Design an enzyme around this catalytic site. Structure first.
Site, PDB file in Angstrom:
ATOM      1  N   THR A   1      35.605  45.142  35.631  1.00 52.91           N
ATOM      2  CA  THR A   1      35.075  44.322  34.739  1.00 52.91           C
ATOM      3  C   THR A   1      34.082  43.554  34.290  1.00 52.91           C
ATOM      4  OG1 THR A   1      36.801  42.863  35.139  1.00 52.91           O
ATOM      5  CG2 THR A   1      35.239  42.198  33.696  1.00 52.91           C
TER       6      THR A   1
ATOM      7  N   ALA B   1      42.539  37.049  36.790  1.00 53.32           N
ATOM      8  CA  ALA B   1      43.329  37.290  34.996  1.00 53.32           C
ATOM      9  C   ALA B   1      44.529  36.404  34.356  1.00 53.32           C
ATOM     10  CB  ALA B   1      43.918  38.637  35.081  1.00 53.32           C
TER      11      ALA B   1
END
Ligand code: MG
Lengths: 212, 250, 233, 235, 240, 231, 222, 244
Positions: A1, A49
């Protein structure tokens, strides 16, 4: 990420990658890491998430209730604090978040708050979060000015994610761009990193270490 | 079910009277006479054992009760209300004092705790006041000998000598003429027996009279030897024979 | 969270053309000690269902009491308790499966593996499994513990898929079950010779067989086996 | 005394029937539903000229697609509005969609009979709930303290309600435009109000599919009042 | 717990406990609020039945809820302390979570909500208090003045009065207050407020309290002598 | 009189007046009819409007694929009781993989209503219900009273003027019980039954509400032009 | 110590077409090295033209599907028999999953159907409720074996037009339902060859405007 | 059910008065008079015991004057048992404040807390109010010497001189007549005793019918001393002021 957000003359640029991994296995290349809280507020996804998705659409609900009750747009300060106060209640239980709450109001101007699952809430001009954060910071720090144009700022955010996507194994897929104005955010497209890398290499003359 | 009486059953009337407390005092007035006298070296409390039936064994009904080794209590009014108050008074002497300070409470503070329980039955939801007045006699190191009266309202007052119940008005006048600050314990017992005879109709002897003193320490009633600082209880209930001996010198 | 103390081993079962068969031995082990030798682990519910249980015996006795209470409760204010509104195998299983999953979700499981065998109102064969984790599944043959590893392979040679069920008679099915129980006695160290067997048929109903024994055992060949390699005498 | 949840010999709840009397004393509110939108209008009724009338809030937004007007003890409406807003937002959180106007109304009406010896008494206020959804189009509901709600093509509540409802009986048809409905609410409010109707003592609002719920400016309403005066003088 | 429904409807659709709470407000000392162009003034009556009072320590009638908002009241004094405490706590809670002080309308809406809640909750009676809440929103120079009452309804006012003989002083304000041109200065606003109380008060001595609130948390209470100068000037113009 | 202040008080003749007053609310309600054959069960309900601008109040509520009811009286109380039935039908399916028997559903409604008649503070329910359903023992029709009394019937009617429909069904008993495998004719009989309770008004397209459940028919409600066929 | 979780194996696959959607899964259920069942259905019709599968720990999987089916039922009760759209179902499932954030359903969930424009739709969830609309998604044991193949044959990744040498990509032309089923069958046939937990049978549920259809195919049983 | 027997202690009358509060005040008007007078160099508390007996042990008796802490004391008028409940609560509040802030509680903060407790019993709970009125005499370094009163309504006010209990109308008039701002403690002692002597319902004012207390900075240098007078000391001050 890799996720970033920075303040400038024309508002806020938000840029993120698109990759999700489970160990070494690439689960997805099409993850939406910018959460559209409402037409005026954006949040970034890093850490968990679900934690980020769930609690930031919840935040959108709390913001909607605020403006129904107070007949006025919620401030970025108040919106960010609702989220940070919520996750602070859960401290110790194992929530995982690292997010930038981004907005542009009359009283504040362009504003970014870094909010963390251990309770941290920091106002700032430039934030970068994720496994590829250090790579993106390098490009940001050496090219950032307050007086960037909207066109140049959008590119700087795109280029900084590309830098991270190249070096960080756990970042890549595609780049999502957003420009936050006082009248709301504007989406500036999905950009495949594969195609973007070669395009930038040729046009910019960078990445001479890579054969193309 | 559930106790749905969460409201006060004792309230102020337009004249400022608390009806249920006044009515409780009326119940005390109907009760059998009990009294207390304080001497220089002791305190005496006494009452009549009004037996409900001659088939009843009146020794099994204790009107004069030990609260602590140095504190005793007697009443006038509703017997059952007194019995539960003695249970609560004995427990509160331990829970709110002895388990904290490692010693028994002084007379005035135990009286204060009993008073608090009686006050709460005058304000709490779904209950009536206690229908008794108590006389509590006791001794403690720093306050010496003392005698207190506690009423249904929760109010309490210290006395040199007093009486409550049936013939209290006449008994208090009798005590005013006889009491002085130089009385020895035996003199106070003598006066107590003289005073109590006036309010008693029938038999007047050791079997119909209940009398106890707060006086000298009784090492013979301690139950163990070996600790010099423990010298025994000051509360002692007089026997039937001990009362009759003092009724000949009457 | 606990540990099983007194335990029961394999439960085995299969479908055939007109119904189902289920079996389990009569032992209650205390670790390696073969402590209790008269334990019934097949528990009938009405005349259409048999519940076979392995694992912790104290928890089995609890489940047995739940099933007994279930029959009592169903009869309350129920004029058709012995007809249209009788307990079905499917009702009994779903109830147990609910309890097992709830108990694992409180981190306090019933330490068992359970097979519910029966015949439904419309004549359909019912056979389904549930365990301490709340896991459930169905198959033409089902077995728990050691039975899963040794009985299933043998029973699957008779009924390999759904289309083999109508071609399998009750005689062929019982034969296969009995043979599997013998194999388990040869090879499972926590098994016994004594077992119970139950048949639930859509025509002939519930047949419950107690005090069965493993017979026709081959041991004679042991006399020729000497040493562990080189020894001749 | 007597229970708060007591039935009368006629089979009606005393407290509910008494709250309906409090609503009759309230200021008038009117709603009209058309195929082009639903209009909501109220009488403000300020008790004194020193009271700043734009602080009188008797028309309220619940969501973008649902509005609401009130009549009776208006303080009692605040917790009802709070609940309605929470229900609308919560459903959007759970289902990523707009809530149906009927479903919102039903959620509000569930609060009504939660009183006893929960709250100590019924609500002393009636609500007109107007909105739009994809399944049933433009809708108008009347929510009472009894827990009952009726759908209406047009409806009036408050002190001038029975005179207004008779007027709505004659004027409503299935082909009304939004503009025709606006004038119709103004006309009937003017008829039942004590004081003379203007842009400061009356308020208009509407809900359309395109623009959502909107409270009208005093300048916008003033023009519609002038348009009304001229067309009544036209015959 | 005590659950009895004390506030209930009557056959004519009235809640008498709420209406009787208004009667307690009618008994209380008079309070008045007037907003100028750039200020708000709160005036309060002190009954002179109590002398030998220590005015240093006696509870004052106007209370600061925050540095920018004030609250005055008419009705039961003990009841008002509970509303004031709750309002002060909510003001600090709002600063803590929203990172901005309360608007005057928000604070009013909260206090009014508390009052309404006490009209349909079991085991409680309504507050025998009406309030005047005045001040300026953060970073705003527009004056704000609101009123609340036991029922829980609230509204904004150009000028308003509550308490005993408030019918008389409202009469005065309705003919003397012009909306097109409000009191342009502090002087004019204080003068109109003292004038309105002099219709009802008695002696203009220690019977009138005046508090002036200006923008940006500028709040001050006038002294006896300062008010006495307004009292003097008003009657000298009246002798004509 | 002196004994109708609450539900916790018997009268000197052993009556419970608060329960009787709750029963009175049903009589004020609009008429609804229930009837069944051996294959199907039908509900017919006359809906009531407030005025000509208003909608017609819904009378029929679905509880499960195989069960549902019609109401007469306080509508919010029907919502509470129908919600409870939905939950109980649901508990039976989830826990026992079993469709809840109509008779057992009646027993549960009886017990829920009873608790509100023996305790202080509460009040009786002010609604009557007609429950139809098809389970393992065929078609069923139940009648619920807020006293707690639940009764299984071939046919019945509750609400204002329900006596006319009830007499018609009592005459037609032998005919309509035999209407097997013909849904349309069973509804016709129900529409003809409810017609014996009408005065001044007649059955229109937004007035009539019909529901049916049967052997191979899930509980379905018909309103609007779907009932024009039966007018 | 008691372990509340287990692994029942299995592999599932969801693909969204232009006006259709398929959700496929193998029928084999396992623990460790044993087969529990050769045919244990894993993909379910949940009503309102929505199909669902929750792969992983089967007890949690069955519990979740059961609770969602229940949620569809109560959605009809509470909102006048309104059809639950695929996007609304997805958001609802997030809340079911996140409700057990600190004691999660140990499953990977996929649903399929049509969106409100009639176009094919697939949604994918992690164990604690994070979700995404996707065109193509495999889940479970052999997901890593299947996804790269789909990237190549559905999205034409790394494929360019002959003669141009990398300059022009192969155009993303739409696939028919017959074409998708061919790719699903080949995906599971290949996964069966190389993953021990995949085999026995393949059940595919196809969703169109006409409703939900089923297709079954044998797989190798070793 | 139970509603039948509920007096409803927390309701308004049609005139907007609280029934129970009004009736509790009526009760307090029959209690022995208590007076507080504030001077520049201290505060005086004087109070009359109700019709006593010769057999009452006076030197160990306390019904009127109570110590809350070293700086604050109260005079009681009403039900003694009700007062002791509130007094113990106030003593705890003072110690809570001292533990929290490490400073003695300011007088008004203690008074407000007790007054709020009284208020609660008039608005919720359905219980009878406390039949007690207090006079608070205290010192802190913010406002110096302070006198307050509170009554069953929970309302409190500050005073230079004040009376509660019986004959307050007569007492307040006498205090209003002779009180001056520059008064000293010794003068205030005399005023308090003279006022009680004139308002008393008894034939004569003697030592055995009085409780007396002073709060003085007459403690060696910048500190405050509380003096609860002994029976012999009340007898001496009665002779000194020329009442006996
Ligand atoms: Mg394989």
């Amino acid at each position: 990420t890799t996720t970033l957000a920075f303040r400038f003359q024309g508002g806020i640029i938000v840029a993120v990658d698109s990759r999700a991994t489970a160990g070494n296995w690439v689960a997805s290349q099409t993850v939406k890491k910018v959460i559209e809280i409402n037409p005026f507020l954006l949040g970034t996804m890093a850490g968990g998430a679900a934690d980020c998705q769930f609690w930031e659409t919840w935040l959108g609900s709390q913001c909607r209730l605020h403006e129904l009750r107070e007949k006025e747009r919620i401030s970025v300060a108040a919106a960010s604090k609702i989220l940070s106060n919520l996750v602070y209640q859960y401290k110790g239980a194992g929530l995982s978040m690292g997010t930038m709450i981004c907005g542009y109001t009359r009283k504040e101007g362009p504003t970014i708050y870094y909010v963390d699952s251990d309770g941290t809430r920091l106002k700032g001009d430039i934030f970068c979060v994720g496994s590829g954060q250090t790579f993106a910071y390098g490009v940001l720090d050496s090219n950032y000015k307050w007086d960037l144009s909207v066109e140049d700022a959008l590119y700087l955010g795109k280029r900084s994610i590309l830098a991270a996507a190249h070096r960080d194994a756990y970042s890549g897929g595609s780049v999502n761009l957003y420009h936050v104005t006082e009248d709301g955010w504007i989406y500036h497209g999905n950009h495949d990193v594969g195609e973007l890398f070669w395009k930038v290499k040729e046009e910019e003359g960078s990445f001479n270490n890579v054969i193309g | 079910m559930t106790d749905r009486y969460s409201f006060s059953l004792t309230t102020f009337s337009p004249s400022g009277k608390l009806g249920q407390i006044d009515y409780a005092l009326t119940a005390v007035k109907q009760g059998v006479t009990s009294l207390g006298i304080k001497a220089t070296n002791g305190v005496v409390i006494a009452t009549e054992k009004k037996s409900s039936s001659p088939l009843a064994m009146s020794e099994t009904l204790s009107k004069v009760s030990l609260l602590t080794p140095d504190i005793g209590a007697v009443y006038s009014g509703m017997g059952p209300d007194y019995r539960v108050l003695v249970d609560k008074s004995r427990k509160v002497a331990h829970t709110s004092y002895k388990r904290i300070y490692g010693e028994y409470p002084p007379t005035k503070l135990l009286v204060s705790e009993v008073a608090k329980i009686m006050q709460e039955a005058t304000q709490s939801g779904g209950v009536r006041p206690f229908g008794v007045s108590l006389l509590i006699a006791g001794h403690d190191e720093f306050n010496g000998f003392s005698l207190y009266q506690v009423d249904p309202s929760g109010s309490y007052f210290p006395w040199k000598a007093t009486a409550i119940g049936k013939g209290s008005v006449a008994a208090k006048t009798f005590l005013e003429k006889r009491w002085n600050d130089e009385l020895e314990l035996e003199d106070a017992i003598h006066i107590a027996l003289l005073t109590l005879k006036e309010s008693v109709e029938g038999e007047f002897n050791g079997d119909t009279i209940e009398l106890a003193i707060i006086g000298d320490e009784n090492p013979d009633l301690l139950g163990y030897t070996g600790i010099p600082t423990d010298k025994g209880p000051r509360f002692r209930k007089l026997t039937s024979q001990e009362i009759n001996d003092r009724l000949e010198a009457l | 969270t606990q540990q099983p103390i007194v335990t029961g081993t394999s439960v085995i079962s299969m479908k055939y053309d007109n119904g189902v068969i289920i079996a389990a031995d009569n032992l209650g082990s205390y670790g390696s000690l073969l402590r209790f030798n008269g334990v019934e682990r097949l528990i009938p519910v009405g005349d259409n269902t048999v519940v076979g249980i392995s694992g912790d015996i104290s928890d089995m006795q609890h489940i047995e009491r739940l099933l007994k209470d279930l029959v009592t409760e169903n009869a309350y204010d129920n004029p058709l308790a012995d007809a249209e509104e009788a307990l079905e195998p499917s009702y009994i299983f779903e109830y147990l499966a609910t309890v097992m999953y709830q108990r694992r979700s409180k981190m306090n499981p019933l330490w068992n593996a359970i097979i519910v065998a029966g015949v439904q109102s419309n004549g359909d064969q019912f056979l389904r499994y549930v365990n301490l984790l709340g896991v459930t599944y169905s198959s033409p043959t089902l077995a728990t513990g050691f039975g899963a590893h040794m009985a299933n392979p043998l029973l699957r040679k008779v009924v390999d898929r759904e289309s083999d069920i109508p071609k399998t008679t009750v005689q062929v099915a019982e034969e296969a079950i009995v043979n599997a129980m013998r194999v388990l006695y040869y090879r499972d160290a926590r098994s016994s010779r004594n077992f119970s067997l139950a048949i639930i048929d859509k025509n002939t109903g519930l047949t419950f067989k107690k005090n069965l024994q493993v017979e026709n055992m081959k041991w004679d060949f042991a006399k020729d086996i000497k040493g562990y390699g080189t020894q001749k005498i | 005394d007597r229970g708060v949840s007591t039935f009368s010999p006629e089979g009606r709840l005393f407290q509910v029937e008494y709250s309906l009397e409090a609503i009759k004393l309230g200021s008038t509110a009117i709603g009209i539903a058309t195929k082009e939108g639903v209009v909501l209008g109220v009488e403000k009724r300020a008790t004194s000229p020193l009271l700043e009338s734009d602080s009188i809030e008797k028309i309220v937004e619940i969501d973008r697609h649902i509005g609401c007007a009130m009549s009776g003890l208006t303080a009692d409406a605040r917790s009802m509005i709070e609940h309605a807003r929470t229900a609308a937002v919560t459903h959007n959180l759970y289902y990523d969609e707009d809530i149906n106007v009927e479903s919102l109304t039903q959620s509000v009406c569930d609060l009504a009979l939660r009183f006893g010896e929960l709250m100590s008494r019924p609500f002393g206020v009636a609500l007109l709930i107007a909105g739009h959804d994809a399944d049933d189009g433009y809708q108008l509901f009347h929510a009472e303290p009894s827990g009952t709600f009726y759908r209406y093509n047009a409806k009036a509540i408050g002190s001038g309600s029975e005179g207004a409802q008779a007027e709505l009986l004659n004027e409503w048809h299935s082909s009304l435009t939004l503009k025709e409905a606006e004038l119709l609410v103004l006309k009937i409010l003017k008829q039942v109000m004590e004081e003379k109707l203007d842009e400061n003592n009356a308020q208009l609002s509407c809900i359309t599919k395109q623009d959502g719920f909107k409270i009208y400016d005093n300048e916008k309403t003033a023009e519609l009042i002038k348009e009304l005066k001229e067309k009544e003088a036209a015959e | 717990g005590y659950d009895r429904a004390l506030s209930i409807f009557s056959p004519d659709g009235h809640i008498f406990q709420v209406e009787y709470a208004l009667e307690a407000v009618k008994r209380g000392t008079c309070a008045v609020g007037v907003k100028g162009k750039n200020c708000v003034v709160l005036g309060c009556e002190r009954r002179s039945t109590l002398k030998l009072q220590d005015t240093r320590i006696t509870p004052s009638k106007v209370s600061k809820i925050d540095s920018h908002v004030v609250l005055s009241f008419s009705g039961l004094n003990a009841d008002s302390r509970i509303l004031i405490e709750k309002a002060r706590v909510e003001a600090q809670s709002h600063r803590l979570t929203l990172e901005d002080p309360v608007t005057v309308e928000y604070l009013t809406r909260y206090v009014a909500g508390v009052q309404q809640r006490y009209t349909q909750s079991g085991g409680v009676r309504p507050f025998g208090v009406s309030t005047l809440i005045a001040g300026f929103d953060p970073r705003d120079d527009e004056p704000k003045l609101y009123q609340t009452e036991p029922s829980g309804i609230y509204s904004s006012w150009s000028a308003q009065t509550i308490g005993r003989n408030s019918k008389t002083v409202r009469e005065f304000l309705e003919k003397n207050y012009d909306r097109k041109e409000p009191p342009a200065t502090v002087e004019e606003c204080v003068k109109l407020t003292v004038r309105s109380l002099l219709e009802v008060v008695q002696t203009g001595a220690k019977n009138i309290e005046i508090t002036v609130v200006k923008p940006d948390s500028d709040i001050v209470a006038l002294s006896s002598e300062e008010i006495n100068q307004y009292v003097t000037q008003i009657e000298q113009e009246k002798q004509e | 009189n002196n004994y109708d202040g609450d539900t916790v008080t018997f009268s000197p003749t052993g009556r419970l007046f608060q329960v009787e007053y709750a029963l009175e609310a049903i009589k004020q309600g609009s008429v609804t009819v229930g009837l069944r054959s051996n294959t199907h069960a039908v509900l017919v309900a006359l809906k009531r409007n407030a005025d000509e601008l208003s909608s017609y109040q819904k009378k029929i509520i679905k509880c499960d694929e195989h069960m549902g009811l019609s109401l007469a009286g306080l509508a919010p109380d029907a919502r509470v009781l129908s919600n409870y039935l939905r939950q109980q039908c649901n508990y039976s399916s989830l826990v026992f993989n079993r469709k809840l028997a109509v008779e057992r559903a009646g027993h549960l409604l009886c017990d829920k209503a009873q608790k509100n008649t023996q305790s202080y503070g509460g009040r009786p329910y002010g609604v009557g219900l007609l429950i139809i359903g098809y389970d393992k023992s065929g078609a069923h029709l139940l009648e619920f009273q807020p006293s707690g009394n639940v009764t299984e019937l071939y046919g019945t009617a509750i609400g204002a003027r329900s006596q006319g429909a009830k007499t018609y069904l009592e005459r037609t008993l032998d005919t309509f019980i035999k209407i097997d495998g013909n849904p349309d004719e069973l509804i016709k009989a129900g529409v003809e039954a409810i017609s014996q309770s009408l005065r001044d008004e007649s059955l229109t397209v937004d007035n009539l509400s019909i529901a049916i459940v049967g052997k191979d028919t899930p509980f379905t409600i018909y309103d609007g032009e779907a009932v024009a066929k039966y007018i | 110590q008691f372990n509340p979780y287990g692994d029942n194996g299995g592999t599932i696959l969801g693909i969204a077409g232009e006006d259709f959607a398929v959700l496929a899964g193998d029928t084999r259920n396992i623990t460790d090295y044993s087969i529990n069942s050769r045919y244990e259905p894993k993909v379910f019709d949940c009503g309102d033209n929505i199909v669902m599968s929750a792969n992983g720990f089967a007890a949690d999987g069955d519990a979740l599907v059961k609770r969602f089916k229940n949620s569809v039922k109560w959605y009809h009760f509470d909102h006048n028999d309104k059809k639950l759209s695929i996007n609304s179902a997805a958001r609802n499932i997030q809340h079911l999953l996140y409700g057990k954030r600190f004691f999660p359903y140990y499953v990977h969930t996929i649903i399929a159907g049509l969106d409100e424009d009639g176009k094919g739709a697939v949604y994918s969830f992690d164990p604690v409720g994070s979700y995404e609309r996707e065109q193509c998604r495999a889940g479970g044991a052999a997901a890593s074996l299947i996804m790269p193949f789909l990237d190549n044959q559905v999205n034409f990744k790394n494929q360019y037009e002959p003669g141009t040498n990398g300059k022009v990509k192969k155009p993303l032309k739409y696939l028919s339902v017959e074409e998708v089923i061919k790719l699903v069958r080949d995906s599971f046939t290949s996964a069966t060859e190389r993953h021990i937990q995949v085999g026995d049978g393949l059940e595919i549920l196809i969703v169109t405007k006409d409703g939900v259809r089923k297709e079954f195919y044998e797989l190798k049983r070793d | 059910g139970s509603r039948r027997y509920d007096s409803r202690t927390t309701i308004f009358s049609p005139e907007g008065r609280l029934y129970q509060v009004e009736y509790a005040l009526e009760s307090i008007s029959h209690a022995g008079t208590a007076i507080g007078i504030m001077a520049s160099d201290g505060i005086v508390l004087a109070a009359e015991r109700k019709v006593t007996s010769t057999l009452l042990e006076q030197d160990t008796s306390t019904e009127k004057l109570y110590k809350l802490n070293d700086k604050i004391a109260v005079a009681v008028a009403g039900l003694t048992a009700d007062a002791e409940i509130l007094i113990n609560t106030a003593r705890i509040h003072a110690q809570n404040y001292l533990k929290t802030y490490n400073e003695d509680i300011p007088v008004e903060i203690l008074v407000r807390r007790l007054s709020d407790i009284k208020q609660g019993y008039t608005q919720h709970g359905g219980l009878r109010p406390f039949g007690v009125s207090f006079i608070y005499a205290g010192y802190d370094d913010r406002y110096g010497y302070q006198l307050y009163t509170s009554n069953p309504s929970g309302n409190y006010t500050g005073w230079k001189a004040i009376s509660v209990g019986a004959n307050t109308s007569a007492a307040q008039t006498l205090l209003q007549m002779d009180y001056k701002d520059d008064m000293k403690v010794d003068d205030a002692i005399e005023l308090a005793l003279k006022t009680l002597s004139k308002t008393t319902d008894s034939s004569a004012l003697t030592y055995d019918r009085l409780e007396f207390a002073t709060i003085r900075k007459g403690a060696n240098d910048g500190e405050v001393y509380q003096k609860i007078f002994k029976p012999q000391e009340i007898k001496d001050i009665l002779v000194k002021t020329g009442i006996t």
